[PDB]
Coordinates of all heavy atoms in Angstrom, one line a residue:
Chain A
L55 N -166.9 175.0 32.8 CA -167.5 173.8 32.2 C -168.2 174.1 30.9 O -168.4 173.1 30.2 CB -168.6 173.3 33.3 CG -168.3 172.1 34.1 CD1 -168.1 170.8 33.1 CD2 -167.1 172.3 35.0
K56 N -168.5 175.2 30.5 CA -169.2 175.6 29.3 C -168.4 175.3 28.1 O -169.0 175.0 27.1 CB -169.8 177.0 29.4 CG -170.1 177.7 28.0 CD -170.7 179.0 28.1 CE -170.0 179.9 29.1 NZ -168.5 180.0 28.8
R57 N -167.1 175.6 28.2 CA -166.2 175.6 27.0 C -166.5 174.4 26.2 O -166.7 173.2 26.6 CB -164.8 175.7 27.3 CG -164.2 174.9 28.4 CD -163.0 175.6 29.2 NE -163.5 176.8 29.8 CZ -162.6 177.7 30.3 NH1 -161.3 177.6 30.3 NH2 -163.2 178.7 31.0
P58 N -166.4 174.4 24.8 CA -166.6 173.2 24.0 C -165.4 172.3 24.0 O -164.2 172.7 24.4 CB -166.8 173.7 22.5 CG -166.1 175.1 22.6 CD -166.2 175.7 23.9
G59 N -165.6 171.1 23.7 CA -164.6 170.1 23.6 C -164.0 169.8 25.0 O -162.7 169.5 25.1
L60 N -164.8 169.7 25.9 CA -164.3 169.4 27.3 C -163.8 168.0 27.3 O -164.5 167.0 26.7 CB -165.4 169.5 28.3 CG -165.5 168.8 29.6 CD1 -164.0 169.1 30.4 CD2 -166.6 169.2 30.5
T61 N -162.6 167.6 27.9 CA -161.9 166.5 27.8 C -161.8 165.7 29.2 O -162.0 166.4 30.2 CB -160.5 166.7 27.2 OG1 -159.7 167.6 28.0 CG2 -160.5 167.1 25.7
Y62 N -161.6 164.4 29.1 CA -161.7 163.6 30.2 C -160.6 163.9 31.2 O -160.8 164.1 32.5 CB -161.6 162.1 29.7 CG -161.6 161.0 30.8 CD1 -162.3 161.0 31.9 CD2 -160.9 159.8 30.5 CE1 -162.4 160.0 32.8 CE2 -160.9 158.9 31.5 CZ -161.5 158.9 32.5 OH -161.5 157.9 33.4
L63 N -159.3 164.1 30.7 CA -158.3 164.5 31.5 C -158.4 165.9 32.0 O -158.1 166.2 33.2 CB -157.0 164.5 30.7 CG -156.6 165.6 29.7 CD1 -155.2 165.3 29.2 CD2 -157.5 165.6 28.6
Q64 N -159.0 166.9 31.3 CA -159.5 168.1 31.8 C -160.5 168.0 33.0 O -160.4 168.6 33.9 CB -160.1 168.9 30.7 CG -160.6 170.4 31.1 CD -159.4 171.3 31.4 OE1 -158.7 171.1 32.5 NE2 -159.1 172.3 30.6
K65 N -161.4 167.0 32.9 CA -162.3 166.8 33.9 C -161.7 166.3 35.2 O -162.0 166.8 36.3 CB -163.4 165.7 33.5 CG -164.3 166.2 32.4 CD -165.4 165.1 32.1 CE -166.3 165.6 31.1 NZ -167.4 164.5 30.6
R66 N -160.7 165.4 35.2 CA -160.0 165.0 36.4 C -159.1 166.2 36.9 O -159.2 166.5 38.1 CB -159.0 163.8 36.0 CG -158.3 163.8 34.8 CD -157.5 162.6 34.6 NE -158.5 161.5 34.3 CZ -158.5 160.3 35.1 NH1 -157.8 160.1 36.0 NH2 -159.4 159.3 34.8
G67 N -158.6 167.0 36.1 CA -157.8 168.1 36.6 C -158.7 169.1 37.3 O -158.4 169.5 38.5
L68 N -159.9 169.4 36.6 CA -160.7 170.4 37.4 C -161.5 169.8 38.5 O -161.9 170.4 39.3 CB -161.8 171.0 36.3 CG -163.0 170.1 35.8 CD1 -164.1 170.3 36.7 CD2 -163.3 170.7 34.4
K69 N -161.6 168.4 38.6 CA -162.0 167.8 39.7 C -161.1 168.2 40.9 O -161.5 168.5 42.0 CB -162.2 166.3 39.6 CG -162.9 165.7 40.7 CD -163.0 164.1 40.6 CE -163.7 163.4 41.6 NZ -163.1 163.5 43.1
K70 N -159.9 167.9 40.7 CA -158.9 168.2 41.8 C -158.9 169.8 42.2 O -158.8 170.0 43.3 CB -157.5 167.8 41.4 CG -157.1 166.4 41.8 CD -157.8 165.4 40.9 CE -157.4 163.9 41.1 NZ -157.9 162.9 40.2
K71 N -159.1 170.5 41.2 CA -159.1 172.0 41.4 C -160.3 172.4 42.2 O -160.2 173.2 43.2 CB -159.1 172.7 40.0 CG -159.1 174.2 40.2 CD -157.8 174.7 40.7 CE -157.7 176.3 40.5 NZ -156.4 176.9 40.9
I72 N -161.5 171.8 42.0 CA -162.6 172.2 42.7 C -162.5 171.7 44.1 O -163.0 172.3 45.0 CB -163.8 171.6 42.0 CG1 -164.4 172.6 41.0 CG2 -165.0 171.1 42.9 CD1 -165.6 172.1 40.2
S73 N -161.9 170.5 44.2 CA -161.8 169.9 45.6 C -160.9 170.9 46.4 O -161.3 171.3 47.5 CB -161.2 168.5 45.5 OG -159.7 168.6 45.6
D74 N -159.8 171.3 45.9 CA -158.9 172.3 46.5 C -159.7 173.6 46.9 O -159.5 174.1 48.0 CB -157.6 172.5 45.7 CG -157.1 171.2 45.2 OD1 -157.2 170.1 45.9 OD2 -156.4 171.2 44.1
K75 N -160.3 174.1 45.9 CA -160.9 175.5 46.1 C -162.2 175.4 46.9 O -162.7 176.5 47.3 CB -161.2 176.1 44.7 CG -160.2 177.2 44.4 CD -160.7 178.1 43.3 CE -160.0 179.3 43.1 NZ -160.8 180.5 42.5
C76 N -162.8 174.2 47.1 CA -164.0 174.1 47.9 C -163.7 173.7 49.4 O -164.4 174.1 50.3 CB -165.0 173.1 47.3 SG -165.7 173.7 45.8

Side-chain angles (χ1 to χ4, degrees):
Chain A
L55 254 298
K56 153 177 52 52
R57 43 209 68 191
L60 161 53
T61 58
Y62 177 38
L63 81 173
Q64 182 68 287
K65 289 180 184 181
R66 34 192 69 241
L68 76 88
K69 192 184 182 292
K70 273 74 173 187
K71 181 68 169 186
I72 270 178
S73 87
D74 313 329
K75 254 198 166 208
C76 291

